Amino acid sequence: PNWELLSSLGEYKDINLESSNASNITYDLEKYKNLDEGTIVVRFNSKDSKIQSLLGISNSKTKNGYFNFYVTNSRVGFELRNQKNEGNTQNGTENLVHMYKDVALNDGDNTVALKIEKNKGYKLFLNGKMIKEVKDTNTKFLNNIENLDSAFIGKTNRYGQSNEYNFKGNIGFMNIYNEPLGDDYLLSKTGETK
């Protein structure tokens, strides 16, 4: 059974992205880069409609080796991609997971969670609802991307002129956990901005 109380692996607060100056958390990369499962919970308030990274963990030497937990004004999701060749090329790209849900967002604060349970599947939660489940008996996550070297709150650091999905607005908090938390907890917690 689930821990009633589990400390976060990563905890970040009050991230001002009103100028899209993304917050560099590569100092914590070691704690995430080999994760096969976990939970990410984010309270956020965007001011744009474009695809924007809540959390971007990447091999900045490639265009397409990254994890991008993102939102728009009408969608939340994540992509997980790997790339075997560095620099200015599309070569060696493996598009591993794209999971998303079209959904109504609040004008102000919203709260989203991504839960990954190793070899069970992935769940997205938003504003007190479990909005999308993808079952998967052979899951992939950060451990599957080669040569990760950057983590940011508010963008994904990619090679050259790639789209970094710069978030504009503020992120009130981000908690990352090494384990998949209970649906009950995530329904209540994301439910704070119902």
Ligand X SMILES: CC(=O)N[C@H]1[C@H]([C@H](O)[C@H](O)CO)O[C@@](O[C@@H]2[C@@H](O)[C@H](O)O[C@H](CO)[C@@H]2O)(C(=O)O)C[C@@H]1O
Residue 57 in contact with ligand X, rule: CB under 6 A: no
Count of beta carbons in the 10 Å neighbourhood of residue 107: 8
Choose the contact partner of 147 out of Ca ion, ligand X, none; CB within 5 to 8 A by kind: none
Distances (CA, A) of 44 to 111, 165, 175: 6, 15, 12
Give yes or no for a contact between 59 and 66, defined as CB atoms under 8 angstroms apart. Answer: yes
Asked if residue 183 belongs to a known ligand binding site, the reply is: no
Select the residue interacting with ligand X from 25, 51, 113, 116 (CB under 6 A).
51
Select the residue interacting with ligand X from 53, 62, 79, 167 (CB under 6 A).
79
Asked if residue 136 belongs to a known ligand binding site, the reply is: yes
Select the residue interacting with Ca ion from 28, 136, 149, 179 (CB under 5 A).
136
Q: Which backbone phi and psi does 192 adopt, to 5 degrees?
A: -60, -25
Residues between 125 and 184 that touch ligand X (CB under 6 A)? 162-163
What is d(CA 85, CA 89) in angstroms, rounded to the nearest whole number? 7
Residues in contact with ligand X by CB under 6 A are 51, 64, 70, 79, 162-163
